[PDB]
Structure 1
């Protein structure tokens, strides 16, 4: 038990000197006990320490909240995953994108959506026009290409289905249901002093810029204690209201496989125990940047683990949990470090406990 601080100090702390990272928060949850380790500074210029109030940008870990919101809407009957976006976004009815179902948008298999929108797309009108003018390339449902606009559109449709803007879906419904007290799409005036600076590869202070459908794709900010509560909810959904319990369980169901990686809703899913290289290969150039033909799930793993990475220009995130061991880990940094280093450090810590 005294083990956990020592393991995090051994495996995470050296990454600060190695990549010149100003600040880091590492959390472990084991048998419903939380451990919070804080290193360095939230702000270099203000000499302000990382602490339990420090707000970090989650980047792509935001996609897990979008997935949870989708699972909540589905199990309340507001949407079906067999529906197409035109059923909710009326101006997309009978357009080519209206042949793609909500699951295919959520799990990046439209067959023609890249990582980013084109830089030129900024306004609400430019976003609509982009989806109106969309045409298929690969057969729909057959090719995974990891995509912000794909899950972004899924998020916008989930919001329309609940008759609230996406920011209010998370801040008024999903975050309260999960018992999160300091998680935001928009950080309010009263919390700006707790919002860390991110640092770019020149160690210049930076925060995420507004972008098209940013909120559902990479737009959430949170604290270490909130993210440990979120991992707690994913490990122990029974303790939570029926609505959010079903939502969470919906995010754990694998939909297809790309070799050893199973794509669930937001979460990446693996057979446990997974080899280090299985976890590293999940975020290789091949999987993250290029199209990959999917297979149906053949081996449905009895014992599963889940992870997700997140990056903004100034922040790095990693979350992993293993239901069978009742254990999980959160890493938040205010400078990006390679995905490899995040996954490897978490692997050694979680394999040395129990």
Structure 2
């Protein structure tokens, strides 16, 4: 590994792991297209299993990027349109607040105040229908962004209806398999359990809990190798041989809404590069300006996504015009600003 990369990564991540008491971490830097891997610490403290290039971590909300790309692929297949009313794919959603709420609003958190989480009380699918029928929007469609699992989770479930595939089968066959992400899972198979890191919350070993729309909003688990491949694919989607997937990748990085310095993609969020990290809270409602029509994927962008579960903390960022990116996977949910600080320190040095 070129010494510059070695040094910038170790000099940044080592103190980070010490300050944040992270049990285990894996990092990939993609530099001029090629990935370089680094690991530290423990996937399972009790059993003294080290983090390796094959360890699975919960991506948490970095999963929203897969959901956005799979939606993008479905659009490219002509199966759905972002301008389609939500009710077109869920006819039972008859309550009048849904008039004017499109797949775009769902995908981009702009439906009018759908909550961060589907309530824990929602167990059955009829419970889920009740939830969305009874939800009262605080705002008109397309006026305010509130980051929400119940918003993009629903987008993901609806985007796959026409295919006739379950969300998992569609994700596996249309995204994971074409990109050779053979160790990326919505449901960890028994064969891979030995690789599945424990997350650590208040020092307790924990895994993600089942919940409504989990798969679609925060349910993917992946290795640092596969996540490096996910970054390469998003960096360079013209490399991709499957036409609708290449298109879906590009659609997920289009700029649909602006709030401050940030643009909302499908799953991905983007800022113009260069940026300062200073530029890069349980509820944060923000007015959005519509980008009419959406701007095509911009190459000079910091494109990123943070992800958390109770026990894990993940971050991915890349800059297309520099062929440069980073994936940070940890089995502790440590503060976002620290992730972004470390990632900026690393990419800025190599750029």
Matches within 5 A, 1:288-327: 289-297=283-291, 303-327=300-324
**Equivalent position to 1:330, from 327, 331, 340:** 327
Task: Describe the superposition over 1:270-308 as per-residue Cα deviations: whole angstroms up to 9, x where unpaired.
Answer: 0100111111xxxxx3xx722111113499767222010
Q: Secondary structure at the match of 2:71?
A: helix
Tell me which of 323, 343, 347 is aligned to 2:344.
Answer: 347
Question: Which structure 1 segments of 5+ residues have no match?
Answer: 280-284
Q: Which residue of 2 aligns with 1:282?
A: none
Displacement of 1:94 after TM fit? 5.8
> Which has the higher mean CA deviation after the structures are superposed, 127-136 or 44-53?
127-136
CA deviations on 1:61-118 (whole Å, 9 max, x unpaired) are 0000000010000010000001122211221146432531001000001112121122
CA distance in 2, matches of 1:211, 1:296: 32
1:263 paired to 2:264:
yes
* C-alpha displacement of 1:2: 1.4
Deviations 1:227-284, CA, capped at 9 Å, x for gaps: 00000001111111212110100011000100101111111110100111111xxxxx
CA RMSD of the aligned region, Å?
1.6
Deviation per CA, 1:317-343, whole angstroms, max 9, x where unpaired? 000000111100000000011101100
1:142 paired residue number: 143
The corresponding residue for 1:51 is 52
Would the aligned equivalents of 1:84 and 1:102 in 2 still touch at CA under 8 Å?
Answer: yes
Deviation at 1:226, TM superposition (A): 0.3
Q: Which residue of 1 aligns with 2:155?
A: 154
In 1, the alpha carbon distance for the partners of 2:143 and 2:227 equals 33
* Deviation, structure 1 residue 134: 2.4
Structure-2 separation of matches of 1:18 and 1:302: 34
Question: Which residue number in structure 1 is paired with residue 165 of structure 2?
Answer: 164
Q: Which residue matches 2:177?
A: 176
Query: Quick check: 1:97–1:131 contact (8 Å CA) kept in 2?
Result: no
Instruction: Name the SS for the 1:328 alignment partner.
Output: strand
Q: Partner residue of 1:195? A: 196
**Cα-to-partner distance string for 1:162-195 (whole Å, 9 max, x where unaligned):** 1111111112221112221100001111111110
Q: Is the 8 A contact 1:85 1:93 kept in 2?
A: no
TM-score with structure 1 length normalisation? 0.94
Alpha-carbon separation, structure 2, partners of 1:12 and 1:334:
14
Bigger mean CA offset, 322-331 vs 87-96? 87-96
Cα distance in 1 for residues equivalent to 2:300 and 2:16: 31
Q: Structure 2, unaligned stretches of length 5 or more? A: none
Does the 8 Å contact 1:25/1:332 carry over to 2?
yes
1:273-292 alignment runs, 5 A limit? 273-279=274-280, 285=281, 289-292=283-286
**Structure 2 counterpart of 1:216:** 216
Contact 1:89 1:160 in 2 (8 A): no
TM-score (norm 2): 0.95
More deviation in 93-102 or 304-313?
A: 93-102
Residue 177 of structure 2 aligns to a residue in which SS?
Answer: helix
